[PDB]
Amino acid sequence: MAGAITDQLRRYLHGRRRAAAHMGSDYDGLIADLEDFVLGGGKRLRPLFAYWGWHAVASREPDPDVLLLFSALELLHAWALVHDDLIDRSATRRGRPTAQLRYAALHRDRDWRGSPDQFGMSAAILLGDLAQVWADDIVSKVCQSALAPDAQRRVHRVWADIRNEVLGGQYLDIVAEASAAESIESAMNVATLKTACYTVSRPLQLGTAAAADRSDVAAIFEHFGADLGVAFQLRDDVLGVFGDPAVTGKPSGDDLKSGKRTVLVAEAVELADRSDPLAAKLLRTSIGTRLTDAQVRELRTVIEAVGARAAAESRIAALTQRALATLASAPINATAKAGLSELA
Amino acid sequence: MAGAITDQLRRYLHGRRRAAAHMGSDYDGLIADLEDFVLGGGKRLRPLFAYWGWHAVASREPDPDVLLLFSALELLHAWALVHDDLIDRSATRRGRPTAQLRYAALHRDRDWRGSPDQFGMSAAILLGDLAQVWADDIVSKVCQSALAPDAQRRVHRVWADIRNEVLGGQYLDIVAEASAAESIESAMNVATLKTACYTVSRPLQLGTAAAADRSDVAAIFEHFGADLGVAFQLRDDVLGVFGDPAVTGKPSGDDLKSGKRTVLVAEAVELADRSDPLAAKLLRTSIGTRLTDAQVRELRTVIEAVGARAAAESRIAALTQRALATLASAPINATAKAGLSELA
Ligand code: DMA
Ligand code: DMA
């Protein structure tokens, strides 16, 4: 359960914090801020996928130290979110201020010298760096103490892949926005790395790798995550354009305001080339620019006008059905087929 | 030898780059930029300290995979330098442009959209992040394939300490400058984490931990690094104030221009309180501010006027002698006593 996975990470963070007390109260406040960020909210979706990858292949429920290994994905996710807020220059995340604004406010509260925003950015870099090195220390610690050497090697390869692919997905995304990549292929490649592999496939394989040597199941979870991950992305693309702010927690047409290069936006350009070339020109010359609220509503209606919203929904229903068809015929326990079908 | 340690890291980086080719030519260019930065210069000082910590306790020269483990300190150092250049907002490093300026120039070369400086900062964050996750993958890989399980646990604890202390030292340093910490104690605590532990003590213990279980030697290398590391810092403090730009590679009085909170600067304030209170007031009200070249020269002369330079030199000679006295009476091989005395 997510609660048992979070409590394992809570105790670990407490232990690392006590061991670092000799470095002063200022660094202790940064560690406490890391605790408040990781534990103070989240769905725990990635450790749950790792839990089912373990159940799909194993019989005994994982040891408590293995749940700590699954929680490392949550601490690793904090590193990604903290650095992503600097990359996106976001001021808030899920209603709470981002790291660079919390430490800039601390700078002003203490009447410190220099640029508060520069201190906030520097501290946010270090905050994300700490979440990464500590999330990795979990994997190294749990592997040496709780896993047979062959499970250690299988776990490390997944750990090396999930961090290499989330960094590649991040760099591919900023290059795609800077280069104005229109193609569905460019947006799909980012979604495969940032969403399919990072959220679904690699977490699933992390639990399977720790359980036993089942290359057949790991290769199947990759195809299962390739469909469910993209279906998750297209759902977010629709919510990012048409979602009600009372459900998404984000402004109306946020993806259009922020200028994301999404699959939905990319497919709207392709469908518009075939139905109204002037609507494709309206999309091309407006994506990623400073858009008023009226421009955003017009683009939202154009996206649904060319059938991009309906094309996305059918693409979601198809991928979700195939992912469940892949899950029903898998050589795994019927308990994981149920749990993973629930999440899907 | 540093050359054999670098060539191990060169082959590893090449292998990781080839394995990541499926993520496109843009990410491949970032990995090639990482190769050019880590391999295209450096003294390899930290892997050498790790080499002598191995020799001090062991008899057989380390395996080639162990030299790769020692090279992980160099790749980890790239992560620290890349993120430090963002923290310090530096434009060049050792005559070459920093990461945020290389990727901003790429942005302008490609006539890309948006802020080039924001893309450069975002790419620099990701570049440093990649150096860290790959430097850690070396440790995880070498431990599972080349070390007995007890050496793995000893290596991991040093790996967890060196990364936790360089992050704490970085945060303590920006807090010290923002809060205008005058005390020698504040500057010394930063020097112990950033220089003593990160450069000397923890690298030494990394090689000793991989060789055998010698808690006696590891505790001695900590005291040896506590003296040699601070002596290294005070030498840099003197060069940062009085050094010839033709030898330091940095402008005259760079520490005063950049506003570093060094031990030398802190001791100058204490000595001035006892000899000329108005000179201490001149230091206090000028450190960390926008200083003209005449203000810098005046502060340089005041620092030597109150005897802070002479006090630093005697403090360097004392620590260097004690570190060699600690090294001569150590229960280690006479080969490492020679090699480590050379570096000192
Ligand atoms: C690596 C990672 C999880 C990035 C977040 O994606 P995003 O920037 O599109 O959205 P948000 O900042 O809202 O999570
Ligand atoms: C963590 C680390 C090695 C920081 C560099 O020290 P610095 O910022 O005082 O100097 P430089 O940028 O010249 O290396």
Ligand SMILES: [Ca+2]
């Ligand atoms: Ca982003």
Ligand SMILES: [Ca+2]
């Ligand atoms: Ca973001």
Ligand SMILES: [Ca+2]
């Ligand atoms: Ca610095």
Ligand SMILES: [Ca+2]
């Ligand atoms: Ca610097």
